Design a protein around this ligand. Structure first.
Ligand SMILES: *[C@@H]1O[C@H](CO)[C@@H](O[C@@H]2O[C@H](CO)[C@@H](O)[C@H](O)[C@H]2NC(C)=O)[C@H](O)[C@H]1NC(C)=O
Ligand SMILES: *[C@@H]1O[C@H](CO)[C@@H](O[C@@H]2O[C@H](CO)[C@@H](O)[C@H](O)[C@H]2NC(C)=O)[C@H](O)[C@H]1NC(C)=O
Lengths: 48, 49, 48
């Protein structure tokens, strides 16, 4: 969240792992940039 | 814009933020209408000293 | 597809604006408003 712009970068990769964050390297591509202009100090993820 | 925006009693439909705890960041926007504390006392409800 | 989105903001209870990002079953939706969010916010499914 930089100078009112909210910047999202992301990646997807296929895996076969049971209960850990996979050991390896790959970079995230810049996905979208959103001009939202609002203080963010906290966040909360939404589960199904 | 005086010929568009001005009105004889005053076009009071244009508002600015007079108070803020701290100065806002580049391209930040704040839509809170909440009461500012200038005193050392806490303040609650619609108004106070 | 259990993780579906995020809240970002500061007050999270409509005293200020906040950002919603959600991937619900038909579309992604992104929205910035004075939201009153839940204490335990989620999305939910009828199973089998
Ligand atoms: C964004 O919001 C946060 C939280 O409301 C602000 O930080 C607060 O600032 C006051 C004054 O320094 C402190 O008394 C609070 O404890 C702070 N809380 C937190 C979580 O930081 C922050 O200053 C705001 N940012 C901008 C740019 O307005
Ligand atoms: C996903 O959420 C969006 C809103 O975030 C829903 O879109 C609404 O759908 C109704 C019915 O077509 C419209 O009347 C509203 O105006 C729509 N609002 C928005 C913001 O899109 C959408 O229906 C949801 N999809 C599912 C499958 O639940």
């Amino acid at each position: 969240n930089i100078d009112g712009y909210f910047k999202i970068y992301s990646k997807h990769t296929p895996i076969n792992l049971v209960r850990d964050l996979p050991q390896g390297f790959s970079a995230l591509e810049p996905l979208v940039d959103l001009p939202i202009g609002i203080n963010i100090t906290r966040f909360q993820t939404l589960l199904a | 814009s005086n010929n568009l925006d001005s009105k004889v009693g005053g076009n009071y439909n244009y508002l600015y933020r007079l108070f803020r705890k701290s100065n806002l960041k580049p391209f930040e926007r704040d839509i809170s209408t909440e009461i500012y504390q200038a005193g050392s006392t806490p303040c609650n409800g619609v108004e106070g000293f | 597809n259990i993780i579906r989105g995020w809240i970002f903001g500061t007050t999270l209870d409509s005293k200020t604006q906040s950002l919603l990002i959600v991937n619900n079953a038909t579309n992604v939706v992104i929205k910035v408003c004075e939201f009153q969010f839940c204490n335990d916010p989620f999305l939910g499914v009828y199973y089998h």
